[PDB]
Design a protein around this ligand. Structure first.
Ligand SMILES: [Cl-]
Ligand SMILES: [Cl-]
Ligand SMILES: [Cl-]
Ligand SMILES: [Cl-]
Ligand SMILES: [Cl-]
Ligand SMILES: [Cl-]
Ligand SMILES: [Cl-]
Ligand SMILES: [Cl-]
Ligand SMILES: [Cl-]
Ligand SMILES: [Cl-]
Ligand SMILES: [Cl-]
Ligand SMILES: [Cl-]
Ligand SMILES: [Cl-]
Ligand SMILES: [Cl-]
Ligand SMILES: [Cl-]
Ligand SMILES: [Cl-]
Ligand SMILES: [Cl-]
Ligand SMILES: [Cl-]
Ligand SMILES: [Cl-]
Ligand SMILES: [Cl-]
Ligand SMILES: [Cl-]
Ligand SMILES: [Cl-]
Ligand SMILES: [Cl-]
Ligand SMILES: [Cl-]
Ligand SMILES: [Cl-]
Ligand SMILES: [Cl-]
Ligand SMILES: [Cl-]
Ligand SMILES: [Cl-]
Ligand SMILES: [Cl-]
Ligand SMILES: [Cl-]
Ligand SMILES: [Cl-]
Ligand SMILES: [Fe+2]
Ligand SMILES: [Fe+2]
Ligand SMILES: [Fe+2]
Ligand SMILES: [Fe+2]
Ligand SMILES: [Fe+2]
Ligand SMILES: [Fe+2]
Ligand SMILES: [Fe+2]
Ligand SMILES: [Fe+2]
Ligand SMILES: [Fe+2]
Ligand SMILES: [Fe+2]
Ligand SMILES: [Fe+2]
Ligand SMILES: [Fe+2]
Ligand SMILES: [Fe+2]
Ligand SMILES: [Fe+2]
Ligand SMILES: [Fe+2]
Ligand SMILES: [Fe+2]
Ligand SMILES: [Fe+2]
Ligand SMILES: [Fe+2]
Ligand SMILES: [Fe+2]
Ligand SMILES: [Fe+2]
Ligand SMILES: [Fe+2]
Ligand SMILES: [Fe+2]
Ligand SMILES: [Fe+2]
Ligand SMILES: [Fe+2]
Ligand SMILES: [Fe+2]
Ligand SMILES: [Fe+2]
Ligand SMILES: [Fe+2]
Ligand SMILES: [Fe+2]
Ligand SMILES: [Fe+2]
Ligand SMILES: [Fe+2]
Ligand SMILES: [Fe+2]
Ligand SMILES: [Fe+2]
Ligand SMILES: [Fe+2]
Ligand SMILES: [Fe+2]
Ligand SMILES: [Fe+2]
Ligand SMILES: [Fe+2]
Ligand SMILES: [Fe+2]
Ligand SMILES: [Fe+2]
Ligand SMILES: [Fe+2]
Ligand SMILES: [Fe+2]
Ligand SMILES: [Fe+2]
Ligand SMILES: [Fe+2]
Ligand SMILES: [Fe+2]
Ligand SMILES: [Fe+2]
Ligand SMILES: [Mg+2]
Ligand SMILES: [Mg+2]
Ligand SMILES: [Mg+2]
Ligand SMILES: [Mg+2]
Ligand SMILES: [Mg+2]
Ligand SMILES: [Mg+2]
Lengths: 173, 173, 173, 173, 173, 173
């Protein structure tokens, strides 16, 4: 108290990073839920399942990088409960993709708020960290999900019998 | 309703598997907390950190295998909040190992209760699943942690200045 | 309207990116003009030609990266006419290098203005994009052209009979 | 004045080659526009995008070969503005293919007019150049685009939800 | 006067970069002093020596990158005397590590001040340069030294006879 | 006091070695200054820059070997400030080479004085060390610089426009 490493690291930034860690862990859990929805016997879209599982693992990596940042800067990780996702039944491939797009935009907004706080506190290391490892990746993820939503809508998902199947086998395959 | 795949799968077993999924996810989170405790600048035992991180990832795999089992048998995954661990500050290498041993025994007791329920419901597939993938692994984990606790105690942890350092560098290295 | 991907992306930034796309395409065209000046039978400096052709292709890549950014962020590309360069006859190796240096400084000033707008609009993704892919590259290009102008001046270009020839064969070779 | 290389090269041919250079650069720009239309989040047909990008680059190569011809024969390149394409929004995969077919026929007509001028001026080198590098390539391009238009029409583009998607993934993939 | 390359480069930034060059050269010299302290016959901790020598060489690289930046931006390097370190006798492995941690924090503070000046002068190229090559590296160095100080303190350095020896042979080996 | 290793090592020799360490570090700094003079945008002789940078690194190695000798013999390194070089602007390739030749002769004279002291104190180990690692290397360096000065003078440096450029590209390339 303080850490022998701590420098130019505001307590508000430390707290905001703890909040972001929880949100990335929550996102990981939402994608985990989606992954195992798509491997139900009455859904059986294995490539949607693999897509969401990969996204889940990426979110865990994002959480871990923030935990490492907390330690690097001499802050103290404070974990909270990881809330369950809003649904177990994700209804359709299109619905899951739409929910994932909304989740990614919400996480993006949180990251932009974190960056604005880091700017306000004159913490260029934290600003650079978010820019280098988070902001670019979030924009790419949002774009990819937007693309997938568009194709599924155009193809006639969820009601058109062939749309999610063909998307599963071509795009996600 | 029911699943076209469901057979000899009691609703109580389905619910018990959902409870076990939550407990494995909780264990994953406890070990994640421990991993990042050991990479604090004022702890700095990197091999303890890597040990706990590996345990965290194993618990996620255990959770996922149960989720796959739920789908295979035609049950429906129902996720709940993942409670935060009991501590962020795990005090010492020995304390963390002792807490991990207790956690593993508690998870073991839950698995034995699950096996007893599966037996009572005449579900040999579920009994076999727990025996093949869980019970053996739990006994090995408990034994390993017992071994680590013993050596740390004998070496004079946590107060002896060299004990956790030497254990970090030899056994966990 | 708006794009399902669009977030924190101001219309002024979208318009400024369209202006920058046109300027990079214009730069590509200036360097293309220079490349084919140096392969005239009455100029015949093949390494100057290859140097400018490479610069032309780089500018097209810079334009394309901005077009991709526009799509990633949910803006809409709006192309305009690519104005012809100021000259077809670039007079000499030194003159071409001096014109290229001026062009690069002018494009740099535009990029700095874009960055200032992105800052004003609180768009750290766009700020990071320009910093990562544009600002560094522009400074290196300006420095390289400054170096080439200096050596050509010192060597006695354009009037000294051996200067552009020797520069063509050593530095650009 | 004249070039020490110039021989049997009529001023009208020199001017016509400059006009053709501009038209090939214009075609390159139309295909560039189309490429980035197909990577919009609300179009998201990546293989259409890659197809048009490849066509764009080919047109630049066609422009460059004419610029090299101008220099080889001792003419002087005179560049003009590259007009923006007729649209930024290309409406659909089928519409883009139909516009590309029309563009290729228009460029073909220009090349045939160039060949007729070269014939009239008794310039067999220029006639041979167009025959060897242009006329054959144009016929193949027109045929390919005709084939793609036919399949898209037959499949029910643009309104049939699966047609452009399936064409993107099979033919252009 | 000014450099033909200079653009958006304030004289205060140029002077601040010259000051930072001197500080990095000074840090290189402090670590050089420490390296050869640890190879004294009455200290003889070869891995501490190699650790500090490596840090010395890194600081020279940091100085050189700033010198290159000065030239890239058209500023003029102005070198000053490199002051001798505060000690020749660094007392112990722990003391050296503590002095190195303080040095790194002091250099970090200078870099943050440089970044704040670059921000104030609207120099995003210089801001990006410090973020990309300096700020991240400084945080990692401070964290590593904090970790080493902690382990040496816990192990009972400097008075405990085995602590620096065991640290030399395990962590730095 | 004395070192358990010290034998036949006079205090005057120990002090003279400390003086020589400072002079080699000073030479390293002069060559560093020269290296970055040659990469200025208004000098831009990259091979002169690389030549001087290599010489700088060699001088650091010479300093380090003396520091190791001090430790080997049980003397104590005492560092002093490294004075800045006499110039930041080195005027021309020829001027830099002439200044480097003078520096090398001055360092040589210091080494000969050190050898004479070692002889006077009956220290054949120190005499052998200077002969084996220093005297030969100094003579070769002086000869190389003499050769470079001669060619630059003969070629008409610094005023002849092609001389330093051609020397940069042939001899130093
Ligand atoms: Cl702080
Ligand atoms: Cl909570
Ligand atoms: Cl800041
Ligand atoms: Cl898609
Ligand atoms: Cl849509
Ligand atoms: Cl059943
Ligand atoms: Cl709960
Ligand atoms: Cl049974
Ligand atoms: Cl053990
Ligand atoms: Cl015990
Ligand atoms: Cl040991
Ligand atoms: Cl927006
Ligand atoms: Cl216009
Ligand atoms: Cl911002
Ligand atoms: Cl140059
Ligand atoms: Cl000049
Ligand atoms: Cl003619
Ligand atoms: Cl026009
Ligand atoms: Cl003919
Ligand atoms: Cl086809
Ligand atoms: Cl048809
Ligand atoms: Cl300026
Ligand atoms: Cl001073
Ligand atoms: Cl700025
Ligand atoms: Cl450590
Ligand atoms: Cl401590
Ligand atoms: Cl003695
Ligand atoms: Cl002094
Ligand atoms: Cl002797
Ligand atoms: Cl020579
Ligand atoms: Cl001479
Ligand atoms: Fe992803
Ligand atoms: Fe990843
Ligand atoms: Fe990945
Ligand atoms: Fe994330
Ligand atoms: Fe709840
Ligand atoms: Fe995400
Ligand atoms: Fe930045
Ligand atoms: Fe394990
Ligand atoms: Fe495993
Ligand atoms: Fe394992
Ligand atoms: Fe487990
Ligand atoms: Fe709670
Ligand atoms: Fe476990
Ligand atoms: Fe059994
Ligand atoms: Fe059994
Ligand atoms: Fe370039
Ligand atoms: Fe490139
Ligand atoms: Fe390149
Ligand atoms: Fe550019
Ligand atoms: Fe005009
Ligand atoms: Fe450029
Ligand atoms: Fe920034
Ligand atoms: Fe030559
Ligand atoms: Fe083609
Ligand atoms: Fe081609
Ligand atoms: Fe091709
Ligand atoms: Fe063409
Ligand atoms: Fe127009
Ligand atoms: Fe074409
Ligand atoms: Fe380091
Ligand atoms: Fe390095
Ligand atoms: Fe390194
Ligand atoms: Fe440094
Ligand atoms: Fe002093
Ligand atoms: Fe440092
Ligand atoms: Fe950055
Ligand atoms: Fe050991
Ligand atoms: Fe040398
Ligand atoms: Fe050497
Ligand atoms: Fe060497
Ligand atoms: Fe030397
Ligand atoms: Fe002085
Ligand atoms: Fe020397
Ligand atoms: Fe000898
Ligand atoms: Mg939250
Ligand atoms: Mg429970
Ligand atoms: Mg413009
Ligand atoms: Mg036309
Ligand atoms: Mg200072
Ligand atoms: Mg001296």
């Amino acid at each position: 108290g303080p850490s022998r490493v701590r420098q130019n690291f505001h307590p508000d930034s430390e707290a905001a990073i703890n909040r972001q860690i929880n949100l990335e862990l929550y996102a990981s859990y939402v994608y985990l839920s989606m992954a195992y929805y798509f491997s139900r016997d009455d859904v059986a879209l294995n490539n949607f399942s693999r897509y969401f599982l990969h996204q889940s693992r990426e979110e865990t990596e994002h959480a871990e990088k923030l935990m490492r940042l907390q330690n690097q800067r001499g802050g103290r990780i404070r974990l909270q409960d990881i809330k369950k996702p809003e649904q177990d039944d994700w209804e359709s491939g299109l619905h899951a993709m739409e929910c994932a797009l909304l989740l990614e935009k919400n996480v993006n907004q949180s990251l932009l708020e974190l960056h604005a706080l880091a700017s306000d506190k004159g913490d260029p290391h934290l600003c650079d960290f978010l820019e280098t490892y988070y902001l670019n990746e979030q924009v790419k993820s949002i774009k990819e999900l937007g693309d997938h939503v568009h194709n599924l809508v155009k193809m006639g998902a969820p009601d058109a019998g062939l749309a999610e199947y063909l998307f599963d086998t071509h795009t996600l395959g």
